[PDB]
Structure 1
Amino acid sequence: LVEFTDEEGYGRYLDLHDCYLKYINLKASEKLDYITYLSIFDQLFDIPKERKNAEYKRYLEM
């Protein structure tokens, strides 16, 4: 419990709620749910979410 948070349940789940909050701030609009956010993270080698030269880079790093 110094290595995992409760939402992660020891390798069962990953918390992406915090990343979803940072993502709302980054897009500057609320037109985007948690489920809509997960569809973004199902992307692999296709069209990017934002322009890859913008501020999306700091978020992607984190």
Structure 2
Amino acid sequence: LVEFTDEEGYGRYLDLHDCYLKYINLKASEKLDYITYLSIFDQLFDIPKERKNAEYKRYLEM
């Protein structure tokens, strides 16, 4: 019931929009677009596209 969102599809899509909006409100970058979002959310432990020495790490944790 509550385990499936609108587009998520009970296991077809997931909720990356919310963390994306949080990262947008954090970094505020005029080119923080689909490619940057997907690259930050696909990899594991690269040199991250934002400072992990700020609350960006906690936001990634959320």
Q: Same fold (TM over 0.5)?
A: yes
**Larger RCO (CA under 8 A, 6+ residues apart):** 2
- Give the length in aligned residue pairs: 62
Secondary structure in 1 aligned to 2:7?
helix
Length-normalised TM-score, structure 2: 0.79
8 Å contact kept, 1:24–1:30: no
8 Å contact kept, 1:50–1:56: yes
Q: Offset at 1:44?
A: 1.3
Moved over 2 A (4+): none
- Structure 1 runs not aligned, ≥5 long: none
- Structure 2 runs not aligned, ≥5 long: none
